[PDB]
Design an enzyme around this catalytic site. Sequence first.
Site, PDB file in Angstrom:
ATOM      1  N   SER B 200       0.901  -1.068   0.157  1.00  0.00           N
ATOM      2  CA  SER B 200      -0.071  -0.075  -0.075  1.00  0.00           C
ATOM      3  C   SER B 200       0.850   1.143  -0.036  1.00  0.00           C
ATOM      4  CB  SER B 200      -0.972  -0.152   1.138  1.00  0.00           C
ATOM      5  OG  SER B 200      -1.963   1.132   1.242  1.00  0.00           O
ATOM      6  N   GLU B 331      -8.514  -5.911  -4.992  1.00  0.00           N
ATOM      7  CA  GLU B 331      -7.726  -4.829  -4.234  1.00  0.00           C
ATOM      8  C   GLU B 331      -8.953  -3.823  -3.595  1.00  0.00           C
ATOM      9  OE1 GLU B 331      -4.815  -3.886  -3.832  1.00  0.00           O
ATOM     10  OE2 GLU B 331      -3.650  -5.513  -4.850  1.00  0.00           O
ATOM     11  N   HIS B 444      -7.423  -6.191   0.151  1.00  0.00           N
ATOM     12  CA  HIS B 444      -6.189  -5.403  -0.122  1.00  0.00           C
ATOM     13  C   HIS B 444      -5.162  -5.847   1.317  1.00  0.00           C
ATOM     14  CE1 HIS B 444      -3.481  -1.834  -1.206  1.00  0.00           C
ATOM     15  NE2 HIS B 444      -3.930  -1.297  -0.285  1.00  0.00           N
TER      16      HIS B 444
HETATM   17  C1  LIG Z   1     -14.927  10.024  13.829  1.00  0.00           C
HETATM   18  C2  LIG Z   1     -14.495   9.643  12.349  1.00  0.00           C
HETATM   19  N1  LIG Z   1     -14.180  10.864  11.374  1.00  0.00           N
HETATM   20  C3  LIG Z   1     -13.687  12.074  12.090  1.00  0.00           C
HETATM   21  C4  LIG Z   1     -11.907  11.971  12.517  1.00  0.00           C
HETATM   22  C5  LIG Z   1     -13.383  10.111  10.177  1.00  0.00           C
HETATM   23  C6  LIG Z   1     -13.676   8.977   9.296  1.00  0.00           C
HETATM   24  C7  LIG Z   1     -12.748   7.773   9.147  1.00  0.00           C
HETATM   25  C8  LIG Z   1     -12.186   7.967   7.674  1.00  0.00           C
HETATM   26  C9  LIG Z   1     -13.068   7.061   6.648  1.00  0.00           C
HETATM   27  N2  LIG Z   1     -12.565   6.604   5.230  1.00  0.00           N
HETATM   28  C10 LIG Z   1     -12.872   7.322   4.260  1.00  0.00           C
HETATM   29  C11 LIG Z   1     -14.151   8.295   4.041  1.00  0.00           C
HETATM   30  C12 LIG Z   1     -12.201   6.881   3.082  1.00  0.00           C
HETATM   31  C13 LIG Z   1     -10.946   6.012   3.233  1.00  0.00           C
HETATM   32  O1  LIG Z   1     -10.653   5.758   2.063  1.00  0.00           O
HETATM   33  N3  LIG Z   1     -10.859   5.412   4.347  1.00  0.00           N
HETATM   34  C14 LIG Z   1      -9.621   4.393   4.287  1.00  0.00           C
HETATM   35  C15 LIG Z   1     -10.256   2.793   4.650  1.00  0.00           C
HETATM   36  C16 LIG Z   1      -9.218   1.967   3.743  1.00  0.00           C
HETATM   37  C17 LIG Z   1      -9.098   0.607   4.848  1.00  0.00           C
HETATM   38  C18 LIG Z   1      -8.293   0.721   6.349  1.00  0.00           C
HETATM   39  N4  LIG Z   1      -7.420  -0.471   6.848  1.00  0.00           N
HETATM   40  C19 LIG Z   1      -7.873  -0.934   8.419  1.00  0.00           C
HETATM   41  C20 LIG Z   1      -7.642   0.298   9.155  1.00  0.00           C
HETATM   42  C21 LIG Z   1      -7.569  -1.748   5.934  1.00  0.00           C
HETATM   43  C22 LIG Z   1      -8.570  -2.734   6.325  1.00  0.00           C
HETATM   44  C23 LIG Z   1      -5.876  -0.146   7.092  1.00  0.00           C
HETATM   45  C24 LIG Z   1      -4.976  -0.521   5.910  1.00  0.00           C
HETATM   46  C25 LIG Z   1      -4.304  -1.578   5.992  1.00  0.00           C
HETATM   47  C26 LIG Z   1      -3.192  -2.189   5.239  1.00  0.00           C
HETATM   48  C27 LIG Z   1      -3.260  -1.518   3.869  1.00  0.00           C
HETATM   49  C28 LIG Z   1      -3.857  -0.192   3.885  1.00  0.00           C
HETATM   50  C29 LIG Z   1      -4.815  -0.013   4.667  1.00  0.00           C
HETATM   51  N5  LIG Z   1      -5.419   1.288   3.921  1.00  0.00           N
HETATM   52  O2  LIG Z   1      -5.116   1.611   2.780  1.00  0.00           O
HETATM   53  O3  LIG Z   1      -6.406   1.946   4.784  1.00  0.00           O
HETATM   54  C30 LIG Z   1     -11.316   5.732   5.336  1.00  0.00           C
HETATM   55  O4  LIG Z   1     -11.117   5.237   6.512  1.00  0.00           O
HETATM   56  C31 LIG Z   1     -15.614  11.311  10.732  1.00  0.00           C
HETATM   57  C32 LIG Z   1     -15.636  12.440   9.435  1.00  0.00           C
HETATM   58  C33 LIG Z   1     -15.157  13.759   9.732  1.00  0.00           C
HETATM   59  C34 LIG Z   1     -15.171  14.618   8.706  1.00  0.00           C
HETATM   60  C35 LIG Z   1     -15.504  14.090   7.335  1.00  0.00           C
HETATM   61  C36 LIG Z   1     -15.620  12.736   7.214  1.00  0.00           C
HETATM   62  C37 LIG Z   1     -15.623  11.992   8.173  1.00  0.00           C
HETATM   63  N6  LIG Z   1     -16.084  10.423   7.794  1.00  0.00           N
HETATM   64  O5  LIG Z   1     -16.194  10.438   6.341  1.00  0.00           O
HETATM   65  O6  LIG Z   1     -16.191   9.764   8.308  1.00  0.00           O
END
Ligand SMILES: CC[N+](CC)(CCCCCn1c(C)cc(=O)n(CCCCC[N+](CC)(CC)Cc2ccccc2[N+](=O)[O-])c1=O)Cc1ccccc1[N+](=O)[O-]
EC number: 3.1.1.7
Lengths: 536, 536
Positions: B200, B331, B444
């Site tokens: 990633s 992916e 992924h």
């Molecule tokens: C309280 C929550 N708020 C305020 C801080 C934020 C919401 C969190 C963000 C949500 N989000 C969005 C909208 C898009 C996006 O692409 N992602 C990434 C998630 C991908 C998968 C995550 N992981 C697990 C942790 C994979 C299973 C990590 C990972 C591991 C290994 C390789 C790659 C990854 N990776 O790429 O992530 C996402 O999380 C609320 C809030 C406030 C203001 C505006 C919008 C929001 N909201 O949209 O929720």
Amino acid sequence: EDPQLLVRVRGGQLRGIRLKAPGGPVSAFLGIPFAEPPVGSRRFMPPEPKRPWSGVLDATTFQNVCYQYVDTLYPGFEGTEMWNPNRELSEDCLYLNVWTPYPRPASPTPVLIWIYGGGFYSGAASLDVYDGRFLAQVEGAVLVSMNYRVGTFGFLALPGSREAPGNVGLLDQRLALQWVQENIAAFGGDPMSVTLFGESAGAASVGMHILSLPSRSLFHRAVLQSGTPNGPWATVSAGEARRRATLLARLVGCPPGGAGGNDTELIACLRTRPAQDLVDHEWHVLPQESIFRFSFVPVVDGDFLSDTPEALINTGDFQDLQVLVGVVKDEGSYFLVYGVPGFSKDNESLISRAQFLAGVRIGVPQASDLAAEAVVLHYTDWLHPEDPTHLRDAMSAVVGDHNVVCPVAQLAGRLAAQGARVYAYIFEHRASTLTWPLWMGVPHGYEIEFIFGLPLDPSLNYTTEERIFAQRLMKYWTNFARTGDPNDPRDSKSPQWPPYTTAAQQYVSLNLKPLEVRRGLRAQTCAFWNRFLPKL
Amino acid sequence: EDPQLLVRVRGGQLRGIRLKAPGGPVSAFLGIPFAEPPVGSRRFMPPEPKRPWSGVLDATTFQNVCYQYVDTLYPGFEGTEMWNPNRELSEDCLYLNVWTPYPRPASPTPVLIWIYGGGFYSGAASLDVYDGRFLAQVEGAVLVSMNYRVGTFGFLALPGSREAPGNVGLLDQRLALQWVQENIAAFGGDPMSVTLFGESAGAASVGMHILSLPSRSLFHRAVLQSGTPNGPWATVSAGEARRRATLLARLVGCPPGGAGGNDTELIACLRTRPAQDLVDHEWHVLPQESIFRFSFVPVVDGDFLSDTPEALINTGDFQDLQVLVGVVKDEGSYFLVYGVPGFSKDNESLISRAQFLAGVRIGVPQASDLAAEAVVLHYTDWLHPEDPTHLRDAMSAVVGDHNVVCPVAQLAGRLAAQGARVYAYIFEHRASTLTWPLWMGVPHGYEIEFIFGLPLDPSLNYTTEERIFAQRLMKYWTNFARTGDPNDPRDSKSPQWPPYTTAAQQYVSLNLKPLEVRRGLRAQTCAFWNRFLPKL
Ligand SMILES: CC[N+](CC)(CCCCCn1c(C)cc(=O)n(CCCCC[N+](CC)(CC)Cc2ccccc2[N+](=O)[O-])c1=O)Cc1ccccc1[N+](=O)[O-]
Ligand SMILES: *[C@@H]1O[C@H](CO)[C@@H](O)[C@H](O)[C@H]1NC(C)=O
Ligand SMILES: *[C@@H]1O[C@H](CO)[C@@H](O)[C@H](O)[C@H]1NC(C)=O
Ligand SMILES: *[C@@H]1O[C@H](CO)[C@@H](O)[C@H](O)[C@H]1NC(C)=O
Ligand SMILES: [Cl-]
Ligand SMILES: [Cl-]
Ligand SMILES: [Cl-]
Ligand SMILES: [Cl-]
Ligand SMILES: [Cl-]
Ligand SMILES: [Cl-]
Ligand SMILES: [Cl-]
Ligand SMILES: [Cl-]
Ligand SMILES: [Cl-]
Ligand SMILES: [Cl-]
Ligand SMILES: [Cl-]
Ligand SMILES: [Cl-]
Ligand SMILES: [Cl-]
Ligand SMILES: [Cl-]
Ligand SMILES: [Cl-]
């Protein structure tokens, strides 16, 4: 003096000729005039019904071919020459032919009306492939085929003017249909069962009789073989027909004496020019360098076509209609040798990538730069982008899908959506007698030989499998014309031909093997042509 | 007292810990500081080399995780929680870990440096999937992994400023690489064989070390797993990074109170903010509703990246480079549950067509209306346009191909054309222990478990077949790091893994079955993404 060959129609008495079909005699009436000759001050004008005559009018022989361009590309070659005029060329061409079993049928027989193709620039009903003795003898049908005006003579239009209203070749066809309505009962045909079927432009013409209200009462079922009213080549806008007509008039020196905007003077000047003077400049008025484009075709005049064909099929009410449609394996093949450089019938036509890009600009002439880029992306194999075989076959596929296959799929989807009963085929069999090169597969219009039953003639050197194949196809078409369904009643064990529907999208393959039902007629590609490219 | 665990590096003495791997002991040195803590006035600033220390430093435990967002979407769920920080969160995070066999190797051993993923908002080297004991014990490798700043703390940029130049997380990575260059010979590593591998964002990071000239003397071979320096999510323009940084500053109540202006004052105020304040407000600055988009990522500053990554990979000279690249089967699978409506991990996630259209607008957020229409066209099956299962899988394929697969295909093609030796894979095997739903397939980042050899641990409840699979993968990776080739040097008819070329386009499938050679990785679809779609 044979009483079966003496027939009286509205206009007068006719003498026919007894012809020998392989399985028995047939009665032929060839060269029956259905219209006053459209000559002199009648040129470009709608047809008028043939005035009654005295005595016995001779119809024992085909009449003359409508004046047209003659294909000179490969002189002496059977592939082109089989489609060339086999009779004298004349502007006095409006005549029709009738084939009936011998003797006349005891009960009224469904009628089949053939409308020939050739891109509205050529063709005749006297061609050998249109011979109706086999259908009449074997299936007992009454087969009618008419000559209609092609090229300028039929389609030169100055929209809005009274002298050159346009679409007068379609009006020739319609007049022949009305002639079948009034006079066909005398030959044993049933005027209440009338099936139009045609190929290439003829097929398109059939569709237009569907979309023109005055024509709808002259026929019941329709068959469109490798052509549609909608699509790139089959119609021109009013302004474009005015442009092409004014340009051709400018090339023949019309009008004279200070020119002006008089339409009556322009058409008056054109009506004094020898036919060949017009045919000489016919191809010069195409707006872009192209293949599968024809200079003078039906125009959207708001009269014969009340709107564009696409709009008419989109919004129409087809609830009571029964349509049979289909294509052949390689529709665009021989068009390539007509001026896409690098393509010839005498070699494999292995082409470079640059030759393929230029070929796309010619074969999709109205495409923008971005639309051409999309076509190249879609038809390229990006594992072998330079492979000359895939480039050549993909060029043929571009032309064929663009002009025929995808328009057919659009028409079947629309008609089926609007409540019509649609049957769809694809003709995959290459004739053993074919003179075109191997790489062209099954080319445009090479299913006609088998629909008309030519392989049943043993002197034509077909295979026995092609004879039984042709018999089966004659059974399909005649079954459709009779019952509105291609499948043989009762029967079964002979896998059925399902109707084409929007949900299932079922069509069958017509080839030597038994009927095979398929789904998705070029589904992804024709979604590109019909759906995406418009947005571009 | 253990003579093998006392090691002296340039900064001082450190005492490690002996760990038990399934087949024998390994040496672990964990939490070695490579940089002075980027805390207080050093926030957003480039790292400074760790100043020497006195005494023997304790290497026996992992250090803090860089301050980062914690995934709350599915509390208690292993699928999400396996990636969450397993140690204390702090702004003093900058530390690295070294794994060597027990005892330490007699002759210099090729070094493997792992750069963790998480989209540059998250991650750490202390995660269980990154545990290097198996590669150290089984394959004898010396494996290093470092913590780098993520989120605002490493990537918040006001380009051109002194106080927050941007990309300081990448400079963290580089500083770790320089530390490895000087000090890795003390652990038995070979500084002249160094292979970067990451997944990633880590993969992207690897790629940028390839495109950044100062980083080029710190490594030899590279491995990019499901990430690229090119493509939509891995970079932002200078102006976009400035926009996001200023917006965040204003959202945390930090203009301070007029606007903006002096960058010293904006950054000075931003440095007074609690770390959790920044983390709380970091997602607010994303310009459109999107998935697979992260607020603060590397910026094109004209410094660390002299040009855009696409520009640098198009014009570069890679002649001596050896790269291993690949993707997994699905992916974009679990990105959809992050706010494409209709997608959740607790049901079959069958969606309507309208939900598919909106889903394309979310998954390709910078696409225009026409570009979205083109995507929907390309990914729709027009035989079954309403089929909910095909629409769910197609949505996953849109996100995956857009953000990962097609960028990998472009990078592989460009590196191969410019003279690098490229090996390409596709990881098709779904872990038997996987907690994500069946419809997500191989999601992924789920190849890392097998690359690091976790299935060799019997307590983890993998299958024996997955033990053999993990061993075979470890042999491919360590063979590549050692020789610049994945293939077993002494072997024949295994079969062989061929290098990716532009002509052949050969890649291999990594699954339980033996190596299968395929051509054309997503060839047509990525032709659509990389070539055509930009022109809209
Ligand atoms: C309280 C929550 N708020 C305020 C801080 C934020 C919401 C969190 C963000 C949500 N989000 C969005 C909208 C898009 C996006 O692409 N992602 C990434 C998630 C991908 C998968 C995550 N992981 C697990 C942790 C994979 C299973 C990590 C990972 C591991 C290994 C390789 C790659 C990854 N990776 O790429 O992530 C996402 O999380 C609320 C809030 C406030 C203001 C505006 C919008 C929001 N909201 O949209 O929720
Ligand atoms: C066209 O020409 C005819 C004959 O010369 C003339 O009678 C007519 O008025 C002209 N039409 C126009 C619009 O000038
Ligand atoms: C085939 O013949 C045509 C016309 O004679 C020519 O233009 C073309 O180059 C030839 N193709 C090959 C592959 O020789
Ligand atoms: C930023 O603010 C300080 C206030 O102490 C001022 O002295 C400095 O000149 C300012 N910087 C710029 C570039 O204006
Ligand atoms: Cl005869
Ligand atoms: Cl005569
Ligand atoms: Cl049109
Ligand atoms: Cl190209
Ligand atoms: Cl077009
Ligand atoms: Cl195709
Ligand atoms: Cl401080
Ligand atoms: Cl050593
Ligand atoms: Cl970008
Ligand atoms: Cl910008
Ligand atoms: Cl739609
Ligand atoms: Cl497309
Ligand atoms: Cl697809
Ligand atoms: Cl590319
Ligand atoms: Cl799946």
